[PDB]
Amino acid sequence: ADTLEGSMAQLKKGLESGTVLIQFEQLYRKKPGLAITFAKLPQNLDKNRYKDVLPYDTTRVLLQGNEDYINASYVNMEIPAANLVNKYIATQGPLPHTCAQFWQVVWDQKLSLIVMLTTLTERGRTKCHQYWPDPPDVMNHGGFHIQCQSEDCTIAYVSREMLVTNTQTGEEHTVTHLQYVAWPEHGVPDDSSDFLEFVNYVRSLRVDSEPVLVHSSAGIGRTGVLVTMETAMCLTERNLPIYPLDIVRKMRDQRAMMVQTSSQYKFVCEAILRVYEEGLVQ
Amino acid sequence: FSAYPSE
DSSP: OOOHHHHHHHHHHHHHHSHHHHHHHHSOSSOTTOOOOGGGSTTTGGGOSSTTOOOOTTTBOOBTTBOOOOOEEEEEEEEGGGTEEEEEEEEOOOOGGGHHHHHHHHHHTTOOEEEEOSOSEETTEESSOOOSOOTTOEEEETTEEEEEEEEEEOSSEEEEEEEEEETTTOOEEEEEEEEEOSOOTTSOOSOHHHHHHHHHHHHHHOOTTOOEEEEOSSSSHHHHHHHHHHHHHHHHHTTOOOOHHHHHHHHHTTSTTOSOOHHHHHHHHHHHHHHHHHTOOO | OOOOOOO
């Protein structure tokens, strides 16, 4: 409610005071009352990369005709005044034994865009399994063969085109894979301008009505920042009010803990203000 | 099984 102008006055003023950060610290991380059962079953415990980052039952991604569990959540951000919904699947970095289910989600829904917001390793520890092959190798995951047909590094991210072939049926599917490598776990992007350019590039690569698969290591911190920013960009361009706290709450009603740290929330709120101001015309 | 680290 209110207007874009008033919401940005409210955000700038509350950044200054700073009531914006206090209200973020007050927000629940996990919505009370939402069941989390499947994620804790004995056969599924080691399918979670982190013990405390689990999908709600209501928004858990199911594999079509397949009972295998995956730690993945549907996250949809509605902009109702624009009759717009931005769909995501937010998931963790696959483990060695969950690559099969990851690629099954991609196949089931013919997802043509994967956004990976992590390096494979940090400080000697593995943060994500390499679920694609180094070109020109071909990888087998759960009855999909994967090959990387193109790989180009920019400054901040790597752009890969991947071919997914179904071993059972012979069909093929192509996926664009963006790996943002300049953004450490529980941190902010190394460069804010690279981040914003990357978010707007992701927006431009959206296919109509198709979820973007977004993941990091846990799939909540850096993913939450990106989702918040894309939502805010859509709201700014449509002259609609932006309440970052409402956005984070809406995400957290669908996948717990989205936007991990106060620094990450402060970063995205400042970025939102920046975008609004440098786009503002008298 | 360990928690997602925080800073």
